[PDB]
Design a protein around this nucleic acid. Sequence first.
RNA 1: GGCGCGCGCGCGCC
RNA 2: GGCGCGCGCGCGCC
Lengths: 121, 121
Amino acid sequence: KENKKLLCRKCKALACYTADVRVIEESHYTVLGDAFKECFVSRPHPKPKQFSSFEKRAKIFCARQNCSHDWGIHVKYKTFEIPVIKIESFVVEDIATGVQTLYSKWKDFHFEKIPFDPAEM
Amino acid sequence: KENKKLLCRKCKALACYTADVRVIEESHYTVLGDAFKECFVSRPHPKPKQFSSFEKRAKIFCARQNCSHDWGIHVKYKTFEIPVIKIESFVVEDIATGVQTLYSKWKDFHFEKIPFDPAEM
RNA sequence: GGCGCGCGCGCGCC
RNA sequence: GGCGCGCGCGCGCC
Ligand SMILES: [Zn+2]
Ligand SMILES: [Zn+2]
Protein backbone atom coordinates (compact mmCIF):
# COMPACT_ATOMS: atom_id res chain seq x y z
CA LYS A 1 0.00 0.00 0.00
CA GLU A 2 0.96 3.64 -0.20
CA ASN A 3 3.85 4.61 1.99
CA LYS A 4 2.77 7.12 4.59
CA LYS A 5 4.10 9.61 7.05
CA LEU A 6 3.70 9.40 10.78
CA LEU A 7 3.75 12.83 12.41
CA CYS A 8 3.55 13.60 16.12
CA ARG A 9 -0.07 13.85 16.98
CA LYS A 10 1.05 16.96 18.91
CA CYS A 11 3.61 19.13 17.06
CA LYS A 12 3.27 17.52 13.63
CA ALA A 13 6.98 16.90 13.16
CA LEU A 14 7.98 14.07 10.87
CA ALA A 15 8.89 10.88 12.77
CA CYS A 16 9.14 8.23 10.06
CA TYR A 17 7.44 6.67 7.01
CA THR A 18 5.74 3.33 7.32
CA ALA A 19 8.47 2.26 4.95
CA ASP A 20 10.86 2.16 7.90
CA VAL A 21 8.31 0.47 10.16
CA ARG A 22 8.54 -3.14 11.39
CA VAL A 23 6.16 -5.39 13.32
CA ILE A 24 6.98 -7.76 16.15
CA GLU A 25 4.87 -10.75 17.00
CA GLU A 26 2.07 -9.16 14.90
CA SER A 27 1.26 -6.48 17.44
CA HIS A 28 4.32 -4.49 18.34
CA TYR A 29 5.67 -1.83 16.08
CA THR A 30 9.15 -0.40 15.85
CA VAL A 31 11.12 1.90 13.51
CA LEU A 32 14.41 1.19 11.65
CA GLY A 33 17.44 3.46 11.28
CA ASP A 34 19.46 6.04 13.22
CA ALA A 35 17.27 8.70 11.58
CA PHE A 36 14.35 7.71 13.78
CA LYS A 37 16.71 7.78 16.76
CA GLU A 38 17.39 11.51 16.42
CA CYS A 39 13.60 11.98 16.45
CA PHE A 40 12.88 10.90 20.03
CA VAL A 41 14.43 10.77 23.47
CA SER A 42 13.81 8.00 25.95
CA ARG A 43 13.69 8.24 29.71
CA PRO A 44 13.77 5.63 32.56
CA HIS A 45 10.42 3.89 32.84
CA PRO A 46 8.68 4.50 36.23
CA LYS A 47 7.37 0.98 36.21
CA PRO A 48 9.50 -1.23 34.00
CA LYS A 49 8.08 -4.73 33.32
CA GLN A 50 8.77 -7.94 31.51
CA PHE A 51 6.05 -9.25 29.28
CA SER A 52 6.02 -11.60 26.31
CA SER A 53 9.41 -11.14 24.67
CA PHE A 54 10.36 -7.73 26.09
CA GLU A 55 11.74 -5.98 29.12
CA LYS A 56 9.93 -2.60 29.00
CA ARG A 57 12.76 -0.30 30.14
CA ALA A 58 12.10 3.18 28.90
CA LYS A 59 9.39 5.59 27.97
CA ILE A 60 9.97 7.53 24.71
CA PHE A 61 8.96 11.02 23.62
CA CYS A 62 8.95 13.33 20.59
CA ALA A 63 12.44 14.90 20.66
CA ARG A 64 11.28 18.42 19.76
CA GLN A 65 11.59 21.59 21.80
CA ASN A 66 8.27 22.28 23.42
CA CYS A 67 6.29 19.08 22.61
CA SER A 68 7.83 16.05 24.37
CA HIS A 69 4.72 14.07 23.52
CA ASP A 70 4.83 10.49 24.77
CA TRP A 71 5.46 8.33 21.70
CA GLY A 72 5.60 5.02 23.51
CA ILE A 73 8.40 2.90 24.95
CA HIS A 74 11.92 1.56 24.52
CA VAL A 75 12.62 -2.08 25.37
CA LYS A 76 15.15 -4.88 25.31
CA TYR A 77 14.14 -7.46 22.68
CA LYS A 78 16.36 -10.52 22.38
CA THR A 79 19.76 -8.77 22.34
CA PHE A 80 18.43 -5.51 20.78
CA GLU A 81 17.28 -2.34 22.47
CA ILE A 82 14.52 -0.73 20.38
CA PRO A 83 11.60 1.70 20.30
CA VAL A 84 8.02 0.31 20.24
CA ILE A 85 5.54 2.99 19.24
CA LYS A 86 1.80 3.40 19.58
CA ILE A 87 -0.05 4.64 16.53
CA GLU A 88 -2.29 6.74 18.77
CA SER A 89 0.49 9.23 19.42
CA PHE A 90 0.98 10.08 15.72
CA VAL A 91 -1.06 11.32 12.73
CA VAL A 92 -0.90 9.37 9.46
CA GLU A 93 -0.54 11.59 6.46
CA ASP A 94 -1.11 10.22 2.99
CA ILE A 95 1.60 11.48 0.67
CA ALA A 96 -0.27 11.93 -2.59
CA THR A 97 -3.26 13.63 -1.01
CA GLY A 98 -2.17 15.16 2.28
CA VAL A 99 -5.18 13.48 3.87
CA GLN A 100 -4.50 12.73 7.53
CA THR A 101 -5.89 10.11 9.81
CA LEU A 102 -6.05 9.45 13.53
CA TYR A 103 -5.77 5.77 14.54
CA SER A 104 -6.11 4.58 18.10
CA LYS A 105 -5.22 0.95 17.51
CA TRP A 106 -2.71 -0.51 15.05
CA LYS A 107 -5.16 -3.26 13.84
CA ASP A 108 -7.20 -0.42 12.20
CA PHE A 109 -4.38 1.14 10.19
CA HIS A 110 -3.96 -1.23 7.23
CA PHE A 111 -0.65 -0.60 5.58
CA GLU A 112 2.12 -2.99 4.60
CA LYS A 113 3.24 -4.53 7.86
CA ILE A 114 6.68 -6.08 7.38
CA PRO A 115 7.63 -8.44 10.27
CA PHE A 116 10.66 -7.33 12.32
CA ASP A 117 13.85 -8.88 11.07
CA PRO A 118 17.15 -9.95 12.68
CA ALA A 119 19.09 -10.08 9.37
CA GLU A 120 18.34 -6.39 8.68
CA MET A 121 19.99 -5.58 12.02
CA LYS B 1 -35.24 -14.30 34.25
CA GLU B 2 -36.93 -14.94 37.56
CA ASN B 3 -38.64 -12.39 39.82
CA LYS B 4 -36.09 -10.34 41.77
CA LYS B 5 -36.50 -7.79 44.52
CA LEU B 6 -35.21 -4.23 44.09
CA LEU B 7 -33.64 -2.77 47.17
CA CYS B 8 -32.50 0.81 47.95
CA ARG B 9 -28.80 0.53 47.27
CA LYS B 10 -27.93 2.61 50.31
CA CYS B 11 -30.18 1.36 53.15
CA LYS B 12 -31.19 -2.08 51.76
CA ALA B 13 -34.90 -1.47 52.19
CA LEU B 14 -37.38 -3.24 49.94
CA ALA B 15 -38.56 -0.96 47.17
CA CYS B 16 -40.32 -3.27 44.80
CA TYR B 17 -40.28 -6.47 42.67
CA THR B 18 -39.27 -6.92 39.04
CA ALA B 19 -42.73 -8.20 38.19
CA ASP B 20 -44.07 -4.69 38.94
CA VAL B 21 -41.61 -2.83 36.76
CA ARG B 22 -42.60 -1.62 33.32
CA VAL B 23 -40.62 -0.06 30.53
CA ILE B 24 -41.71 3.19 28.89
CA GLU B 25 -40.59 3.78 25.30
CA GLU B 26 -37.76 1.28 25.73
CA SER B 27 -35.64 3.34 28.11
CA HIS B 28 -37.47 4.32 31.22
CA TYR B 29 -38.50 2.27 34.15
CA THR B 30 -41.47 2.97 36.30
CA VAL B 31 -43.19 0.78 38.97
CA LEU B 32 -46.84 -0.25 39.25
CA GLY B 33 -48.86 -0.55 42.48
CA ASP B 34 -49.39 1.19 45.84
CA ALA B 35 -46.76 -0.76 47.74
CA PHE B 36 -44.06 1.13 45.80
CA LYS B 37 -45.74 4.41 46.65
CA GLU B 38 -45.42 3.62 50.30
CA CYS B 39 -41.66 3.47 49.60
CA PHE B 40 -40.56 6.81 48.22
CA VAL B 41 -41.14 10.47 48.93
CA SER B 42 -41.28 13.15 46.23
CA ARG B 43 -39.67 16.57 46.42
CA PRO B 44 -39.60 19.61 44.06
CA HIS B 45 -37.33 18.95 41.12
CA PRO B 46 -34.33 21.33 41.32
CA LYS B 47 -34.23 21.95 37.56
CA PRO B 48 -37.28 20.69 35.66
CA LYS B 49 -36.96 19.92 31.95
CA GLN B 50 -38.90 18.17 29.23
CA PHE B 51 -37.44 15.24 27.27
CA SER B 52 -39.57 13.60 24.55
CA SER B 53 -43.09 12.82 25.85
CA PHE B 54 -42.09 13.31 29.52
CA GLU B 55 -41.90 16.32 31.78
CA LYS B 56 -39.78 16.34 34.92
CA ARG B 57 -42.10 17.16 37.81
CA ALA B 58 -40.00 16.01 40.80
CA LYS B 59 -37.18 14.11 42.43
CA ILE B 60 -38.11 10.95 44.31
CA PHE B 61 -36.16 9.46 47.21
CA CYS B 62 -36.07 6.45 49.46
CA ALA B 63 -38.77 6.82 52.20
CA ARG B 64 -36.73 5.50 55.14
CA GLN B 65 -35.94 8.80 56.87
CA ASN B 66 -32.34 8.03 57.78
CA CYS B 67 -31.70 7.13 54.15
CA SER B 68 -33.38 9.50 51.71
CA HIS B 69 -31.40 7.97 48.88
CA ASP B 70 -32.19 9.50 45.51
CA TRP B 71 -34.11 6.91 43.46
CA GLY B 72 -34.91 9.05 40.43
CA ILE B 73 -37.73 11.28 39.30
CA HIS B 74 -41.44 11.68 38.92
CA VAL B 75 -42.93 12.69 35.59
CA LYS B 76 -46.04 13.22 33.55
CA TYR B 77 -46.14 10.68 30.74
CA LYS B 78 -49.16 11.52 28.64
CA THR B 79 -52.07 11.40 31.09
CA PHE B 80 -50.05 9.66 33.79
CA GLU B 81 -47.98 10.88 36.72
CA ILE B 82 -45.50 8.14 37.38
CA PRO B 83 -42.14 7.47 38.96
CA VAL B 84 -39.18 6.84 36.69
CA ILE B 85 -36.28 4.99 38.41
CA LYS B 86 -32.60 4.38 37.70
CA ILE B 87 -31.32 0.90 38.60
CA GLU B 88 -28.05 2.43 39.84
CA SER B 89 -29.88 3.55 43.02
CA PHE B 90 -30.90 0.01 43.78
CA VAL B 91 -29.61 -3.44 44.53
CA VAL B 92 -31.24 -6.29 42.68
CA GLU B 93 -31.71 -9.22 45.08
CA ASP B 94 -32.37 -12.77 43.86
CA ILE B 95 -35.23 -14.00 45.99
CA ALA B 96 -34.09 -17.66 46.40
CA THR B 97 -30.45 -16.85 47.34
CA GLY B 98 -30.07 -13.36 48.82
CA VAL B 99 -27.40 -12.82 46.16
CA GLN B 100 -27.29 -9.09 45.28
CA THR B 101 -26.23 -7.38 42.05
CA LEU B 102 -25.23 -3.83 41.37
CA TYR B 103 -25.96 -2.46 37.95
CA SER B 104 -25.18 1.07 36.78
CA LYS B 105 -27.27 0.91 33.61
CA TRP B 106 -30.67 -0.71 32.85
CA LYS B 107 -29.43 -2.15 29.55
CA ASP B 108 -26.99 -4.42 31.57
CA PHE B 109 -29.81 -5.81 33.70
CA HIS B 110 -31.56 -8.64 31.95
CA PHE B 111 -35.01 -9.62 33.20
CA GLU B 112 -38.48 -9.73 31.62
CA LYS B 113 -39.00 -6.17 30.60
CA ILE B 114 -42.75 -5.88 30.34
CA PRO B 115 -43.67 -2.66 28.38
CA PHE B 116 -45.79 0.11 29.90
CA ASP B 117 -49.44 -0.55 28.98
CA PRO B 118 -52.09 2.18 29.57
CA ALA B 119 -54.77 -0.47 30.08
CA GLU B 120 -53.02 -1.38 33.33
CA MET B 121 -53.84 2.20 34.36
C1' G C 1 3.75 -1.59 23.99
C1' G C 2 -0.75 -5.02 23.12
C1' C C 3 -5.53 -6.32 25.19
C1' G C 4 -9.30 -5.26 28.74
C1' C C 5 -10.97 -2.64 32.55
C1' G C 6 -12.20 0.85 36.82
C1' C C 7 -12.45 6.13 38.46
C1' G C 8 -12.73 11.56 38.74
C1' C C 9 -14.71 16.21 36.40
C1' G C 10 -16.52 18.65 31.97
C1' C C 11 -20.52 18.87 27.38
C1' G C 12 -24.48 18.06 24.29
C1' C C 13 -29.25 15.94 22.49
C1' C C 14 -34.23 13.18 23.07
C1' G D 1 -34.66 9.45 33.42
C1' G D 2 -32.03 7.73 28.93
C1' C D 3 -28.19 8.28 25.32
C1' G D 4 -23.74 10.31 22.74
C1' C D 5 -19.03 12.66 23.50
C1' G D 6 -14.45 15.51 25.51
C1' C D 7 -10.59 15.96 29.01
C1' G D 8 -7.58 13.78 32.86
C1' C D 9 -6.03 9.64 36.87
C1' G D 10 -5.28 4.65 37.81
C1' C D 11 -5.46 -1.10 37.60
C1' G D 12 -4.61 -6.28 35.62
C1' C D 13 -2.34 -10.22 32.66
C1' C D 14 0.60 -11.47 28.82
ZN1 LIG E 1 6.00 16.54 19.01
ZN1 LIG F 1 -32.97 3.68 51.52
